[PDB]
Swiss-Prot record, chain A:
One of its GO terms (molecular function) is tRNA binding. Pfam families: Ribosomal_L27 (PF01016). The gene is rpmA. PROSITE patterns: RIBOSOMAL_L27. Part of the 50S ribosomal subunit. Cross-links to the 23S rRNA. Cross-links to the A and P site tRNAs. This is Large ribosomal subunit protein bL27. One of its GO terms (cellular component) is cytosolic large ribosomal subunit. Keywords: Ribonucleoprotein, Ribosomal protein, RNA-binding, rRNA-binding, tRNA-binding. It comes from Escherichia coli (strain K12). PANTHER family: LARGE RIBOSOMAL SUBUNIT PROTEIN BL27M, RIBOSOMAL PROTEIN L27.
Swiss-Prot record, chain B:
It comes from Escherichia coli (strain K12). This is Large ribosomal subunit protein uL16. HAMAP family: Ribosomal_uL16. GO terms for molecular function: rRNA binding; structural constituent of ribosome; tRNA binding. InterPro entries: Ribosomal_uL16, Ribosomal_uL16_bact-type, Ribosomal_uL16_CS, Ribosomal_uL16_dom, Ribosomal_uL16_sf. Binds directly to 23S ribosomal RNA and is located at the A site of the peptidyltransferase center. It contacts the A and P site tRNAs. One of the last ribosomal proteins to be assembled in the 50S subunit. The simultaneous presence of uL16 and bL36 probably triggers ObgE's GTPase activity and eventual dissociation from the mature 50S ribosmal subunit. It has an essential role in subunit assembly. GO terms for biological process: cytoplasmic translation; ribosomal large subunit assembly. The modification (3R)-3-hydroxyarginine is found at R81. Signal peptide: none annotated. NCBIfam families: rplP_bact (TIGR01164). The modification N-methylmethionine is found at M1.
UniProtKB/Swiss-Prot annotation, chain C:
Belongs to the prokaryotic/mitochondrial release factor family. It is found in: Cytoplasm. The chain holds residues 4 to 68 of 140 of the full protein. The gene is arfB. Keywords: Cytoplasm, Hydrolase, Translation regulation. One of its GO terms (molecular function) is ribosome binding. This is Peptidyl-tRNA hydrolase ArfB.
Curated annotation (Swiss-Prot), chain E:
Belongs to the prokaryotic/mitochondrial release factor family. GO terms for biological process: regulation of translation; rescue of stalled ribosome. This is Peptidyl-tRNA hydrolase ArfB. It is found in: Cytoplasm. The keyword Metal-binding does not apply. Its EC number is 3.1.1.29. It is an enzyme of class 3 (hydrolase). Rescues stalled ribosomes. Can hydrolyze peptidyl-tRNA on ribosomes stalled by both non-stop mRNAs and mRNAs that contain rare codon clusters or ribosomes stalled in the middle of mRNA. First identified as a complementary ribosome rescue system when the stalled ribosome cannot be rescued by the SsrA(tmRNA)-SmpB quality control system or the alternative ribosome-rescue factor A (arfA). It comes from the Bacteria. Associated with 70S ribosomes and polysomes. The chain holds residues 4 to 100 of 140 of the full protein. It comes from Escherichia coli (strain K12). The unstructured C-terminal region is required for ribosome binding and peptidyl-tRNA hydrolase activity. The C-terminal tail functions as a sensor to discriminate between stalled and actively translating ribosomes by binding in the mRNA entry channel downstream of the A site between the head and shoulder of the 30S subunit. This allows the N-terminal globular domain to sample different conformations, so that its conserved GGQ motif is optimally positioned in the peptidyltransferase center (PTC) to catalyze the hydrolysis of peptidyl-tRNA.
RNA sequence: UGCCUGGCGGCCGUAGCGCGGUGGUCCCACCUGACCCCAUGCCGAACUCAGAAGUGAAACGCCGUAGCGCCGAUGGUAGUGUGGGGUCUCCCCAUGCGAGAGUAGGGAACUGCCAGGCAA
RNA sequence: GCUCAACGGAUAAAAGGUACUCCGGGGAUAACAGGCUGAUACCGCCCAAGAGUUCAUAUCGACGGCGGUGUUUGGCACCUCGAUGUCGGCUCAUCACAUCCUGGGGCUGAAGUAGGUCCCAAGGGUAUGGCUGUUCGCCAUUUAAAGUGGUACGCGAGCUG
RNA sequence: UCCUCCUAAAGAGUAACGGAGGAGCACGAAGGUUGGCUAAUCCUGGUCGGACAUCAGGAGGUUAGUGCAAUGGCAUAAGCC
RNA sequence: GGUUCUCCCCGAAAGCUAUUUAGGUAGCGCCUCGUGAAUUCAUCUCCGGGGGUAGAGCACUGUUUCGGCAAGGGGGUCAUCCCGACUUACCAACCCGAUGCAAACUGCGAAUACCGGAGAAUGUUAUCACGGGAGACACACGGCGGGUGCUAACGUCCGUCGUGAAGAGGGAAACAACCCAGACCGCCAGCUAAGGUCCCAAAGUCAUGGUUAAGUGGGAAACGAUGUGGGAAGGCCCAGACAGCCAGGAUGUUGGCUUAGAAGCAGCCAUCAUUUAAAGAAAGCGUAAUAGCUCACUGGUCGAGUCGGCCUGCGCGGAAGA
């Protein structure tokens, strides 16, 4: 007697770690903050993680709470 | 009918019954009724097993129940078609995996405890066995 | 004081036949969805209140009860 | 006093252990000090009636391996789910 | 099909040569007929439900014990209908 | 350089909490005063300045301690890709992969840059 | 400036009936009947507290459990919509055995008579009327007994309607 | 029609008259910045005050809070002034 | 509904979106033809990744069991109006320990899968963009993972694969999807696949070792049973065991208690030491209550193994329809 549903938003990691992405590429489209911005990586207003420079993506684990960061090194 | 009062949801999936048991060791008591087959123990049977076991030992001893239903299983009203939504919960079942101990006893001789479990097995749908508490 | 519905499961005979009146071919054929029970006097649940149902002139109840 | 014979294995896996348990012999392991955790393979039937005795889990056992005698101590026993059979025993090399 | 069992001897306040007993209200027989029990105006039943039973003709103590209890269950069956 | 203290990182619970002991030339903390800069939706506690007689309780560092937290094999087990099988509401065989929990055990950190102090 | 919420929004503006029906289509989708399943129904069985003076199993057997058949109601739409005419009665049957009588046996809370219950058995047999459109059912009176079902809940290119 | 969860078989996506709930707004501040602060609930004492009023210490630790449903996320606070 | 000669090449879909749409249609997905393009794409290996599913776990979200502890409301002796002393036998949580469960729980967590890079072989370019023309948008079953359903259905709805659909030929007696296997044509040729080799019906009455008495094979459950084979452990055992046979089975007793008649045997209930190789103040029948036969139990003769269960191989009953 309820039967309802919301249209999925296609979240998750679009471009993975190890990809030489372009300037302005969305690295991860998330809802919370499962991944934080790092070097040359911009965090959007919806916490969408975008790029600034070019190069391969690295998923770094740092911080006290072991939260995952993402950076882009130009190689 | 052993129902868990004040629960979270009201009706859930039927799911599957896979793998072996977890609570396989014979705890606390000296004896235990272990499960051999793979079935679905309802609350009414469980009530019947405890009823048909206290008559044999006659008020003495300690009766432990190493199981609990906690699974609301629904049924559809008879003479209505399919669909229209999932039915209303009728009874509660306990999922049973092979190797799960059901009842444990202590404060009773090896003789009287054994035939007590013989009557309890006749009230349950699953094929069982009888095992002693082993050290280490 | 304390009173609880008994309705002896099995002691009450239950038959099923077709309905009466009008209603297409579903009421003369598979209309066996109609009941017609049988509660003999041999049942006797209260025993002494039972003899009061038998001598009690009423319809829906024969001479043999 | 509670001596029993043993043998070392050649294959350590699910394909191995299931295959050998069907021919009446079960796997075990012993560990102690800084040596190698020896993969023990011993007879099934004898040990079942051996562990029925409660003194089996108190006294220092005296298992053998290729002539050598090693005094071990039973620590953990991994029984069967619903059958009166044995699966894996963890001895501590004492 | 409705097995009857009027089990006496329970929540009672039987005070007493010829009995003058009361009946406790906070229990015995639920709201559907309890409201039917609390809505009787015959001035034997007070405004609380601690009913003042004044059975005095059944002389003997143990006799009036049950006769006043008979006055109780008879008043009960009338008000539980 | 052996140790020292403080700032800033790496590595981020093997690195931390609890308990007991312990350090003061210097450093740090505490401490003195607060009409001036500034300050409390009240208050020199916090914040800021000006100083610093006394001290090491507190805080911090260090040491012992596993009293707790944490790390964690080997083997087994669960599961599982593919291919076969059965009694096929679930398991078995071949083969590749292979946990979590638990056990032995480990464990009260390691390292770099800078600045002066120390007996140099 | 539109709850154009039937929310990609047919016009600015729109509710019903048809058994007087009608055409074009569909077994893509119902009603009868068949098929799969067997929840339900029916039958059988396991357990055994209690009842039965005593006594669980002469006769029952609560609490629960395990199957069978495919006669009920259902589920599902797989066949039929360029048609498979559907209740009852009549006529004529016919098969099954989970047997109502006759026959052959065991037990008994079987003295005798008469009974209760289980097992073997399907050869033969297995009412007439009153009331109702009835199946059923109630009743009157019988009979050794007035079986249960399957057979498109047999039978309308056989009748009745 | 739209939003969150689950079903959704560890990318995305994925139905059912499947299982749970919400939206048809609010705010010039609840927005931006700078600076500061960072809980809930319990033990104890104390003017009326007891179940919790205000205040103080202690434990505790984000079980808090975030204009709203739920999930995800947050103290380097997006929490509070 | 019907839609008329032939041959050659390739070859679908029954999905998603939206629709007064749901048996229509539109675009995209999949087919085809032509065009032009980058080792462009696919399988394997290595490498670099994030996932949280299965499993698992129980700190968290809830739920559940037992034990140790434990205030507070009440109950009570009481205040015998509060205050209050005490106990708590009660409802008795909170915390500690021990045990389970979860689609909407996660301090854990694979395998696969998915995205990206490098590397080799291979494939008539299998990848993509562009244009011409489509069809199709009713799908079915089987396998695996589910929802739903009664862990019913050739049921229904998805995911994914396969097959049919649009694919014959062999096999499962018959049998679109099950197993093997992809028909260019011809041959009175040979080798295999699933499956088979007494006859029907082409091929072993084949070779060796065991198993079953039911025609099991060749329909099935709980459950019952000295069926019978294998294997292991245990008990007593020619100071002679098991079972028959030769005998006893006793002393107080009405056993005290209700001693109302209920004498080991209607019932509470408790139950000793004697004669000794042994004998329960009692197993059953029968009894108002007796007795008797006695059974446990204990000695002799015969005189050798035997008793009771455990795990399994295969069977028997359970098992009745037109």
């Amino acid at each position: 007697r309820n039967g309802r549903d919301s249209e999925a938003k296609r979240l998750g990691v679009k471009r993975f770690g190890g990809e030489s992405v372009l300037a302005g590429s969305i690295i991860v489209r998330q809802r919370g903050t499962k991944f934080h911005a790092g070097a040359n990586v911009g965090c959007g207003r919806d916490h969408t993680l975008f790029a600034k420079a070019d190069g391969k993506v690295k998923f770094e684990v740092k911080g006290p709470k072991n939260r995952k960061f993402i950076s882009i090194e130009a190689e | 009918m052993l129902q868990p009062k004040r629960t979270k949801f009201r009706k859930m999936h039927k799911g599957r019954n896979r793998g072996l048991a977890q609570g396989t060791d014979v705890s606390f008591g000296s004896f235990g009724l272990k499960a051999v087959g793979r079935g679905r123990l309802t609350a009414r049977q469980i009530e019947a097993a405890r009823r048909a076991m206290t008559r044999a030992v006659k008020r003495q001893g300690k009766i432990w129940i190493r199981v609990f239903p906690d699974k609301p299983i629904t049924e559809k009203p008879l003479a209505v078609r399919m669909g229209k939504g999932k039915g209303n919960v009728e009874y509660w079942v306990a999922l049973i995996q092979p190797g799960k101990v059901l009842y444990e006893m202590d404060g009773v001789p090896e003789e009287l405890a054994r035939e007590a479990f013989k009557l309890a097995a006749a009230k349950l749908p699953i094929k069982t066995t009888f095992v002693t508490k082993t050290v280490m | 004081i304390s009173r609880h519905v008994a309705i002896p499961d099995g002691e009450l005979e239950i038959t099923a036949i077709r309905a009466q009146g009008a209603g297409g071919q579903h009421v003369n054929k598979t209309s066996t969805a109609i009941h017609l029970r049988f509660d003999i006097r041999a049942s006797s649940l209260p025993e002494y209140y039972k003899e009061r149902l038998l001598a009690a002139s009423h319809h829906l109840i024969s001479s043999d009860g | 006093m509670f001596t029993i014979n043993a043998e070392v294995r050649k294959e350590q896996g699910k394909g191995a252990s299931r295959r050998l348990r069907a021919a009446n012999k079960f796997p075990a392991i012993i560990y102690g000090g800084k040596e190698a955790p020896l993969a023990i393979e011993l007879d099934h039937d004898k040990v079942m009636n051996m562990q029925a005795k409660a003194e089996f889990y108190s006294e220092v056992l005296t298992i053998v391996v290729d002539g050598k005698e090693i005094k071990v101590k039973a620590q953990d026993v991994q029984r069967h789910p619903y059958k009166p059979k044995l699966q894996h025993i963890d001895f501590v090399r004492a | 099909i409705s097995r009857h069992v009027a089990i006496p001897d329970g929540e009672l306040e039987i005070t007493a040569a010829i009995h003058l007993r009361f009946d406790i209200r906070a229990s015995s027989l639920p709201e559907y007929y309890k409201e039917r029990l609390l809505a009787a105006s015959h001035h034997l039943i007070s405004s609380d439900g601690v009913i003042v039973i004044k059975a005095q003709e059944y002389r003997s103590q143990e006799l009036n014990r049950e006769a006043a209890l008979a006055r109780l269950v008879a008043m009960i069956k009338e008000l539980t209908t």
